[PDB]
Design an enzyme around this catalytic site. Structure first.
Site, PDB file in Angstrom:
ATOM      1  N   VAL A   1       0.947   9.804  -6.320  1.00 37.31           N
ATOM      2  CA  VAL A   1       1.221  11.200  -6.004  1.00 37.31           C
ATOM      3  C   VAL A   1       2.557  11.586  -6.612  1.00 37.31           C
ATOM      4  O   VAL A   1       3.618  11.284  -6.066  1.00 37.31           O
ATOM      5  CB  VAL A   1       1.255  11.451  -4.479  1.00 37.31           C
ATOM      6  CG1 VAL A   1       1.430  12.942  -4.205  1.00 37.31           C
ATOM      7  CG2 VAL A   1      -0.031  10.953  -3.839  1.00 37.31           C
TER       8      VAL A   1
ATOM      9  N   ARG B   1       0.809  -1.210   0.000  1.00 36.34           N
ATOM     10  CA  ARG B   1       0.000   0.000   0.000  1.00 36.34           C
ATOM     11  C   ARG B   1       0.848   1.268   0.000  1.00 36.34           C
ATOM     12  O   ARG B   1       0.454   2.282  -0.581  1.00 36.34           O
ATOM     13  CB  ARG B   1      -0.943   0.017   1.200  1.00 36.34           C
ATOM     14  CG  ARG B   1      -1.994   1.114   1.111  1.00 36.34           C
ATOM     15  CD  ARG B   1      -2.757   1.224   2.403  1.00 36.34           C
ATOM     16  NE  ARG B   1      -3.802   2.241   2.354  1.00 36.34           N
ATOM     17  CZ  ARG B   1      -4.200   2.925   3.418  1.00 36.34           C
ATOM     18  NH1 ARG B   1      -3.632   2.694   4.595  1.00 36.34           N
ATOM     19  NH2 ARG B   1      -5.162   3.827   3.313  1.00 36.34           N
TER      20      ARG B   1
ATOM     21  N   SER C   1       8.194  10.166  -2.569  1.00 30.81           N
ATOM     22  CA  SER C   1       7.851  11.444  -1.958  1.00 30.81           C
ATOM     23  C   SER C   1       7.061  11.208  -0.674  1.00 30.81           C
ATOM     24  O   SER C   1       7.115  12.014   0.254  1.00 30.81           O
ATOM     25  CB  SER C   1       7.040  12.319  -2.923  1.00 30.81           C
ATOM     26  OG  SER C   1       5.779  11.747  -3.214  1.00 30.81           O
TER      27      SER C   1
ATOM     28  N   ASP D   1     -10.387  -9.396   2.968  1.00 33.57           N
ATOM     29  CA  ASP D   1     -10.822 -10.649   2.364  1.00 33.57           C
ATOM     30  C   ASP D   1     -11.233 -11.646   3.453  1.00 33.57           C
ATOM     31  O   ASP D   1     -10.394 -12.123   4.213  1.00 33.57           O
ATOM     32  CB  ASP D   1      -9.677 -11.195   1.500  1.00 33.57           C
ATOM     33  CG  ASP D   1      -9.984 -12.546   0.893  1.00 33.57           C
ATOM     34  OD1 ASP D   1      -9.110 -13.067   0.160  1.00 33.57           O
ATOM     35  OD2 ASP D   1     -11.081 -13.090   1.147  1.00 33.57           O
TER      36      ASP D   1
ATOM     37  N   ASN E   1      -3.421   8.920   4.312  1.00 33.79           N
ATOM     38  CA  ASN E   1      -2.263   8.345   4.999  1.00 33.79           C
ATOM     39  C   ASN E   1      -2.301   8.488   6.514  1.00 33.79           C
ATOM     40  O   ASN E   1      -1.885   7.584   7.239  1.00 33.79           O
ATOM     41  CB  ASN E   1      -0.963   8.975   4.493  1.00 33.79           C
ATOM     42  CG  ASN E   1      -0.666   8.622   3.054  1.00 33.79           C
ATOM     43  OD1 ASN E   1      -0.715   7.458   2.672  1.00 33.79           O
ATOM     44  ND2 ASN E   1      -0.342   9.627   2.251  1.00 33.79           N
TER      45      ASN E   1
ATOM     46  N   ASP F   1      -4.214 -13.964  -3.090  1.00 32.44           N
ATOM     47  CA  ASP F   1      -4.833 -14.844  -4.072  1.00 32.44           C
ATOM     48  C   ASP F   1      -6.009 -14.137  -4.723  1.00 32.44           C
ATOM     49  O   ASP F   1      -6.308 -12.990  -4.398  1.00 32.44           O
ATOM     50  CB  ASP F   1      -5.282 -16.143  -3.397  1.00 32.44           C
ATOM     51  CG  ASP F   1      -6.073 -15.896  -2.130  1.00 32.44           C
ATOM     52  OD1 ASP F   1      -6.324 -16.872  -1.383  1.00 32.44           O
ATOM     53  OD2 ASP F   1      -6.446 -14.728  -1.881  1.00 32.44           O
TER      54      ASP F   1
ATOM     55  N   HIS G   1      -6.568  -5.909  -2.254  1.00 38.56           N
ATOM     56  CA  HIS G   1      -7.416  -6.088  -1.090  1.00 38.56           C
ATOM     57  C   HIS G   1      -7.658  -7.565  -0.809  1.00 38.56           C
ATOM     58  O   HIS G   1      -8.621  -7.931  -0.130  1.00 38.56           O
ATOM     59  CB  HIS G   1      -8.750  -5.370  -1.277  1.00 38.56           C
ATOM     60  CG  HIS G   1      -8.684  -3.853  -1.182  1.00 38.56           C
ATOM     61  ND1 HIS G   1      -9.715  -3.042  -1.648  1.00 38.56           N
ATOM     62  CD2 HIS G   1      -7.632  -3.084  -0.658  1.00 38.56           C
ATOM     63  CE1 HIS G   1      -9.234  -1.793  -1.471  1.00 38.56           C
ATOM     64  NE2 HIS G   1      -8.051  -1.779  -0.927  1.00 38.56           N
ATOM     65  N   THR G   2      -6.789  -8.413  -1.345  1.00 35.14           N
ATOM     66  CA  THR G   2      -6.903  -9.841  -1.107  1.00 35.14           C
ATOM     67  C   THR G   2      -6.312 -10.109   0.276  1.00 35.14           C
ATOM     68  O   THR G   2      -6.348 -11.234   0.769  1.00 35.14           O
ATOM     69  CB  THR G   2      -6.147 -10.671  -2.168  1.00 35.14           C
ATOM     70  OG1 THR G   2      -6.349 -12.067  -1.910  1.00 35.14           O
ATOM     71  CG2 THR G   2      -4.662 -10.363  -2.130  1.00 35.14           C
TER      72      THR G   2
ATOM     73  N   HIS H   1       0.433   4.285  -2.659  1.00 34.68           N
ATOM     74  CA  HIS H   1       0.276   5.689  -2.273  1.00 34.68           C
ATOM     75  C   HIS H   1       1.434   6.552  -2.753  1.00 34.68           C
ATOM     76  O   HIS H   1       1.291   7.766  -2.913  1.00 34.68           O
ATOM     77  CB  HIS H   1       0.149   5.826  -0.761  1.00 34.68           C
ATOM     78  CG  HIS H   1      -1.218   5.507  -0.246  1.00 34.68           C
ATOM     79  ND1 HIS H   1      -1.636   5.853   1.022  1.00 34.68           N
ATOM     80  CD2 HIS H   1      -2.274   4.899  -0.836  1.00 34.68           C
ATOM     81  CE1 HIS H   1      -2.890   5.473   1.189  1.00 34.68           C
ATOM     82  NE2 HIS H   1      -3.300   4.893   0.077  1.00 34.68           N
ATOM     83  N   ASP H   2       2.586   5.935  -2.974  1.00 34.03           N
ATOM     84  CA  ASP H   2       3.723   6.693  -3.452  1.00 34.03           C
ATOM     85  C   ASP H   2       3.535   7.023  -4.930  1.00 34.03           C
ATOM     86  O   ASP H   2       3.695   8.168  -5.342  1.00 34.03           O
ATOM     87  CB  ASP H   2       5.018   5.906  -3.267  1.00 34.03           C
ATOM     88  CG  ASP H   2       6.206   6.607  -3.898  1.00 34.03           C
ATOM     89  OD1 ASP H   2       6.165   7.850  -4.001  1.00 34.03           O
ATOM     90  OD2 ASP H   2       7.177   5.929  -4.281  1.00 34.03           O
TER      91      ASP H   2
HETATM   92  C1  HEM Z   1      -9.463   1.539  -6.038  1.00 36.13           C
HETATM   93  C2  HEM Z   1      -9.222   2.469  -4.949  1.00 36.13           C
HETATM   94  C3  HEM Z   1      -8.899   2.099  -3.646  1.00 36.13           C
HETATM   95  C4  HEM Z   1      -9.522   2.553  -2.528  1.00 36.13           C
HETATM   96  C5  HEM Z   1     -10.650   3.584  -2.470  1.00 36.13           C
HETATM   97  C6  HEM Z   1      -8.893   1.910  -1.388  1.00 36.13           C
HETATM   98  C7  HEM Z   1      -9.247   2.126  -0.036  1.00 36.13           C
HETATM   99  C8  HEM Z   1      -8.562   1.585   1.074  1.00 36.13           C
HETATM  100  C9  HEM Z   1      -8.920   1.829   2.466  1.00 36.13           C
HETATM  101  C10 HEM Z   1     -10.029   2.727   2.982  1.00 36.13           C
HETATM  102  C11 HEM Z   1      -8.044   1.132   3.228  1.00 36.13           C
HETATM  103  C12 HEM Z   1      -8.114   1.007   4.745  1.00 36.13           C
HETATM  104  C13 HEM Z   1      -7.181   2.001   5.415  1.00 36.13           C
HETATM  105  C14 HEM Z   1      -7.274   1.969   6.931  1.00 36.13           C
HETATM  106  O1  HEM Z   1      -8.157   1.265   7.467  1.00 36.13           O
HETATM  107  O2  HEM Z   1      -6.462   2.653   7.588  1.00 36.13           O
HETATM  108  C15 HEM Z   1      -7.112   0.477   2.311  1.00 36.13           C
HETATM  109  C16 HEM Z   1      -6.131  -0.445   2.713  1.00 36.13           C
HETATM  110  C17 HEM Z   1      -5.292  -1.172   1.858  1.00 36.13           C
HETATM  111  N1  HEM Z   1      -5.274  -1.038   0.469  1.00 36.13           N
HETATM  112 FE1  HEM Z   1      -6.610  -0.056  -0.641  1.00 36.13          FE
HETATM  113  N2  HEM Z   1      -7.810   1.122  -1.802  1.00 36.13           N
HETATM  114  C18 HEM Z   1      -7.777   1.282  -3.181  1.00 36.13           C
HETATM  115  C19 HEM Z   1      -6.773   0.750  -3.993  1.00 36.13           C
HETATM  116  C20 HEM Z   1      -5.680  -0.023  -3.573  1.00 36.13           C
HETATM  117  C21 HEM Z   1      -4.559  -0.395  -4.422  1.00 36.13           C
HETATM  118  C22 HEM Z   1      -4.391   0.040  -5.866  1.00 36.13           C
HETATM  119  C23 HEM Z   1      -3.701  -1.150  -3.652  1.00 36.13           C
HETATM  120  C24 HEM Z   1      -2.492  -1.770  -3.993  1.00 36.13           C
HETATM  121  C25 HEM Z   1      -2.260  -2.499  -5.202  1.00 36.13           C
HETATM  122  C26 HEM Z   1      -4.269  -1.164  -2.337  1.00 36.13           C
HETATM  123  C27 HEM Z   1      -3.721  -1.879  -1.245  1.00 36.13           C
HETATM  124  C28 HEM Z   1      -4.199  -1.835   0.058  1.00 36.13           C
HETATM  125  C29 HEM Z   1      -3.671  -2.601   1.173  1.00 36.13           C
HETATM  126  C30 HEM Z   1      -2.707  -3.771   1.101  1.00 36.13           C
HETATM  127  C31 HEM Z   1      -4.335  -2.194   2.274  1.00 36.13           C
HETATM  128  C32 HEM Z   1      -4.176  -2.776   3.653  1.00 36.13           C
HETATM  129  C33 HEM Z   1      -3.083  -1.993   4.341  1.00 36.13           C
HETATM  130  C34 HEM Z   1      -2.801  -2.487   5.739  1.00 36.13           C
HETATM  131  O3  HEM Z   1      -3.410  -3.493   6.156  1.00 36.13           O
HETATM  132  O4  HEM Z   1      -1.964  -1.866   6.417  1.00 36.13           O
HETATM  133  N3  HEM Z   1      -5.471  -0.445  -2.277  1.00 36.13           N
HETATM  134  N4  HEM Z   1      -7.444   0.743   0.994  1.00 36.13           N
HETATM  135 CA   LIG Z   2       5.119   9.789  -4.934  1.00 34.20          CA
HETATM  136 CA   LIG Z   3      -6.729 -13.376   0.135  1.00 35.68          CA
END
Ligand code: HEM
Ligand SMILES: [Ca+2]
Ligand SMILES: [Ca+2]
Length: 307
Positions: free
Chosen positions: A47, A39, A53, A223, A71, A231, A171-172, A43-44
């Protein structure tokens, strides 16, 4: 200068190994670190491109992206990046940029969690400033509709629906705070009712994990099938209306999902199809407006610009 996977094969052939080892040890005490690191790379790149950055701390001249809505009290694992950074710096002084380091860390995290394995393009350099405002405008929100989600991706340079659907597969695994789904569970879009696209049986489960007026910072798995394994189960959940956040379920339920629906099913039916698409999308995200050649620098401490 074109990015290349063999960029460090002569200057630091053990870079990926050092990154991998760092994550392997961290995973023993924090099984969430793999998802967190992927993640951070996401996020990097969204932006000003993948220029580390986001790793920059505050300065009197510019604010840190760490205080962005997406963030603050959310992004994590920064200390872990410093750790592998220090290790790589010992093995290869002033060679590997933080931008490339974070990219490798993301790839290794995916592989360690059971995901595909591949060599990411390298050659990116580190920014000379952080972009808080740009992070608040570019980072997508969990309540975005499909059109807004598509717009957010197209805004940074990803026009393909496959990019959105594949990259959403991140989000797997990983965690999400109750805060972001309270509306779906008790009052979606001021209807006084839960989001109708959320499986009623799962709705009950989520309501128990996130009661109204309860701890909004409590964590829930993205998931429900395999919380920590990388997966294609994430897509199987969507097919049963079990996506965790609004932005997940819309990839399959939105009235504008004519193009994303077939993609969700495709990745849901075959792991290989999803893995190939994930790698492709990841490298495209990794190629967003990178600084190359002599542009930018090789930051020694990912938290501050070299002086
Ligand atoms: C399509 C738009 C997306 C939205 C609106 C979204 C939204 C979110 C939200 C709300 C969280 C929870 C943050 C928290 O509870 O503090 C999150 C976590 C996460 N997202 Fe997404 N996300 C998106 C795309 C992605 C992408 C592109 C990736 C990476 C390929 C990604 C990877 C992750 C990961 C792995 C987490 C878990 C982080 C952790 O457990 O520390 N997300 N996302
Ligand atoms: Ca950046
Ligand atoms: Ca999974």
């Amino acid at each position: 200068m074109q990015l290349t996977p063999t960029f460090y094969d002569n200057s630091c052939p053990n870079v990926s190994n050092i990154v991998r080892d760092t994550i392997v040890n961290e995973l023993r005490s924090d099984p969430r670190i793999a998802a967190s690191i992927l993640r951070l790379h996401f996020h990097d790149c969204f932006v000003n491109g993948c220029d580390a950055s986001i790793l920059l701390d505050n300065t009197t001249s510019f604010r840190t992206e760490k205080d962005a809505f997406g963030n603050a009290n959310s992004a994590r694992g920064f200390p872990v990046i410093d750790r592998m950074k220090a290790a790589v710096e010992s093995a290869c002084p002033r060679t590997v940029s933080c931008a490339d380091l974070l990219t490798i860390a993301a790839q290794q995290s995916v592989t360690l969690a059971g995901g595909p394995s591949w060599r990411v393009p390298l050659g990116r350099r580190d920014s000379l400033q952080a972009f808080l405002d740009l992070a608040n405008a570019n980072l997508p929100q969990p309540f975005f509709t499909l059109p807004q989600l598509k717009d957010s991706f197209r805004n940074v340079g990803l026009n393909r629906s496959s990019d959105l659907v594949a990259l959403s597969g991140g989000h797997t695994f990983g965690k999400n705070q109750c805060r972001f789904i309270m509306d779906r569970l008790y009052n979606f879009s001021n209807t006084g009712l839960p989001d109708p696209t959320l499986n009623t049986t799962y709705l009950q489960t989520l309501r128990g994990l996130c009661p109204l007026n309860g701890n909004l910072s409590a964590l829930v798995d993205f998931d429900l099938r395999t919380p920590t394994i990388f997966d294609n189960k994430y897509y199987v959940n969507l097919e049963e209306q079990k996506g965790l956040i609004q932005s997940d379920q819309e990839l399959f339920s939105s009235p504008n999902a004519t193009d994303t629906i077939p993609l969700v099913r495709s990745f849901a039916n075959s792991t290989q199809t999803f893995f190939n698409a994930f790698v492709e999308a990841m490298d495209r995200m990794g190629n967003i407006t990178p600084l190359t050649g002599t542009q930018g620098q090789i930051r020694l401490n990912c938290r501050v610009v070299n002086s």
